[PDB]
């Protein structure tokens, strides 16, 4: 990606609030994508940077994009680079607390906030239009990745409300409200 998009991903990772705002005003893509597959919103979410998540959503970030990163091993093959570089970059530019063996293809920012078990980040994404029913490539919802506690309770409630809005054909009504 461009210099501005690359700086935005780093500022979103680093919780550098001033820089995120600056870069967006200079034309950085709010859906900026790392060469290895993830967005600024995803990396803000896994790092519990709920203030960065707020800013990106306000500038129009799509909450429902899925990660193109799969696993260290598979992504390394699909890109023709060695797994060592992929592992270091995933750990250094994204987050170092995830399972290196697992596949994350199709994970949304909400999947990642749930793995981070952060109530505030999860709530901000749900309030921002994140679809709690959207599954990743392995077929898991964000609630599938929740641990017991306040995030799992919030997701259970939100799933039921989202399903009811979908059945009543009124998702767009509620999206344009507070």
List the helices and strands and how they pair.
Layout: H1 3-14, H2 17-25, H3 40-46, H4 50-58, H5 72-79, H6 83-93, H7 109-115, H8 119-127, H9 150-167, H10 171-175
- Helical run tally: 10
The number of E-state strands comes to 0
CATH architecture annotation name = Alpha Horseshoe
CATH superfamily: Ankyrin repeat-containing domain
Q: Work out the radius of gyration.
A: 16 Å
Oligomeric state of the chains present here: monomer
Major sheet summary line:
none
Helices and strands: which structural class? mainly alpha
Strand content: under 5%
Can you tell me the CATH class? Mainly Alpha
- Rough shape? globular
> The CATH topology is what?
Serine Threonine Protein Phosphatase 5, Tetratricopeptide repeat
Organism: Homo sapiens
Protein name: Mitochondrial disaggregase
Family: Belongs to the ClpA/ClpB family.
Subcellular location: Mitochondrion intermembrane space
